[PDB]
Design a protein around this ligand. Structure first.
Ligand SMILES: *[C@@H]1O[C@H](CO)[C@@H](O[C@@H]2O[C@H](CO)[C@@H](O)[C@H](O)[C@H]2NC(C)=O)[C@H](O)[C@H]1NC(C)=O
Ligand SMILES: *[C@@H]1O[C@H](CO)[C@@H](O[C@@H]2O[C@H](CO)[C@@H](O)[C@H](O)[C@H]2NC(C)=O)[C@H](O)[C@H]1NC(C)=O
Ligand SMILES: *[C@@H]1O[C@H](CO)[C@@H](O)[C@H](O)[C@H]1NC(C)=O
Ligand SMILES: *[C@@H]1O[C@H](CO)[C@@H](O)[C@H](O)[C@H]1NC(C)=O
Ligand SMILES: *[C@@H]1O[C@H](CO)[C@@H](O)[C@H](O)[C@H]1NC(C)=O
Ligand SMILES: *[C@@H]1O[C@H](CO)[C@@H](O)[C@H](O)[C@H]1NC(C)=O
Lengths: 226, 226
């Protein structure tokens, strides 16, 4: 097996795979979508350059992982923004999919086993944290008012306890002290490939008034077999 | 800044950049040079897929790192084998250089500041551990009888303490209980690029009787800014 961790105190494009409109600012923040110019239908993705082993066939053992990151979404109109930001596990070498509500991660509305993608979505359209497993129809959600915290930093903690197939998400907006959480049972070994690229993806609104930016400020990840 | 670590208990090509004759066996071992067929002038390199940040200019701070790995060199004729195996820090995206004594890492004998390559060489020709800094003329060496331990596993520990510019190497052959060590003062930030690829390189003898294999069995690495 292979364990791996990284702690991104400030982003640098050198160790990332940037796709779409994703860029790293001079301040070292990950800008997933356009922050200037045409933000309509802007889409970007970014993954750590090294693949992460999730399933080691030889030991019939699965890895557990933990990832913490902070982000900030800044919308034009806090009551009509879209679409959201997502943390995702995707196939190594994969290219962006559909924009809009597909978040650049999916290309069909219904379940598609061949997608091999799991994502934790911070949906600004519905104001919910959603766990999407190979489809945009969430297997679990919980309301989380992102709009009330427009332009504020959110601290997120995601853990995957493999023995229990337990994926847990906790979010906190220190400014308002709003907390959001959601968990779901997801057998990763069946839903994603043996190795995956971990990262983020985001899509901005299709019209002038529904645009918003999606920036990740810091990010640490750790996976290990046990 | 960015910290990174990984623990390779069994090798897999998915998270490696393989060059030359380097391959990963079904047993999960890294075979840097040809183990079957023509081993004459075989050369191979392998690096972790994600670049490692060494110098974060914005903070006027340098990373320290620690790396442990085990290897096995197996020569046909223990008195005439060449050339060796090396742990190296090279420029991101770099391709192999010259073979033979150059180890696939260098292309000139004298110092070349533009090489931006630092290596800890387990030299089978001279039977010494050598610290090469942008040149094959080692800045420090100590005898280490690899031949007397032909085909045996060596456990190596390398640490770089940035505040002191201290690079230390410790090797142990559990089977014979022979230990080798060598240290040197190397200001990494002045000798390598801000970001580097970490890994191995090896070259096999040019003649039938001087050939040998170079296998890495396990490897863990960790770099941290402090
Ligand atoms: C990402 O890392 C690179 C390499 O350290 C940084 O680029 C260097 O920045 C310094 C100071 O601005 C320049 O003098 C060098 O010429 C740059 N080197 C290269 C290869 O571009 C870059 O600034 C870092 N990114 C961020 C956002 O900090
Ligand atoms: C490196 O990892 C890959 C992916 O897990 C391993 O390849 C799989 O091996 C199993 C068992 O042999 C096969 O059933 C799959 O079809 C393979 N998948 C792929 C994508 O190749 C590979 O064996 C691992 N390498 C080592 C040395 O263990
Ligand atoms: C979705 O994307 C995958 C990979 O690009 C492709 O194989 C598949 O055919 C696509 N499906 C549709 C309906 O476009
Ligand atoms: C995330 O934070 C929690 C608590 O602060 C910690 O236990 C965990 O190890 C962290 N994970 C990473 C990848 O930093
Ligand atoms: C070594 O490689 C570099 C690659 O740019 C090249 O400029 C240099 O001339 C090479 N050395 C020799 C002696 O050719
Ligand atoms: C290497 O091993 C030593 C002692 O076993 C340990 O202190 C160190 O943290 C290890 N480093 C890595 C990268 O595994």
């Amino acid at each position: 097996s292979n364990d791996a961790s990284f702690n991104v105190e400030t982003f640098n494009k050198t160790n990332l795979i940037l796709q779409g409109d994703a860029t790293v600012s001079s301040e070292g923040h990950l800008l997933l979508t356009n922050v200037k110019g045409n933000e309509e239908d802007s889409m970007g993705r970014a993954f750590y350059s090294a693949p992460i082993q999730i399933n080691d066939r030889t030991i019939d053992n699965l890895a557990s992982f933990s990832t913490n990151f902070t982000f900030r979404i800044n919308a034009k109109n806090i009551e009509n923004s879209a679409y959201g930001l997502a943390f995702a596990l995707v196939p190594v070498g994969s290219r962006p999919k559909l924009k809009g509500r597909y978040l650049g991660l999916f290309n069909t509305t219904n379940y598609d086993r061949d997608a091999h993608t799991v994502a934790v979505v911070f949906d600004t359209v519905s104001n919910r944290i959603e766990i999407d497993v190979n489809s945009i129809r969430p297997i679990a959600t919980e309301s989380c008012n992102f709009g009330h915290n427009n332009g504020e930093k959110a601290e997120v903690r995601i853990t995957y306890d493999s023995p229990k197939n337990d994926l847990r998400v906790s979010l906190l907006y220190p400014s308002s002290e709003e907390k959001c959480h959601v968990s779901a049972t997801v057998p990763l070994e069946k839903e994603v490939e043996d190795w995956v690229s971990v990262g983020f993806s985001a899509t901005s609104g299709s019209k002038k008034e529904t645009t918003e930016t999606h920036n990740v400020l810091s990010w640490s990840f750790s996976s290990n077999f046990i």
